[PDB]
Design a protein around this nucleic acid. Structure first.
Length: 42
RNA sequence: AUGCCUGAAUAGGGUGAAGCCAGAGGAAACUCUGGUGGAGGCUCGCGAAUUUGGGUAUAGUAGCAAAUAUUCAAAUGAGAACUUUGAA
């Protein structure tokens, strides 16, 4: 009964941590990509 | 040997390069995983070679001339294996 609460709490916390790391990486990558595109047309 | 002008042709199978997308590891650089993409001195059926047209430069013996399967009936004709029609 409580095992389900513990399991989905831990799973969704892990999902949020992975999402935070992935979003940081994606934001850095997209920022660098658009800066390179801006400086590439010359 | 090296060319020039105007045309035809430069096919197919396999593999899967940069670049890109979504993920995981790392502070970056980067490295793996899946996809996408469709590139090449990649493969498959000092030397040699490097498709093609037109134009234009520097004893009646050997044997039967070799491309397989012919058959039946009728017509023509002096004469039909070889011509013609039908059937196989």
């Amino acid at each position: 009964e409580e095992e389900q609460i513990e399991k989905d709490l831990q799973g969704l916390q892990e999902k949020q941590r992975l999402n935070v790391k992935r979003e940081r990486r994606r934001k850095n990558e997209m920022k660098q990509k658009e800066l390179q595109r801006m400086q590439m047309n010359m």
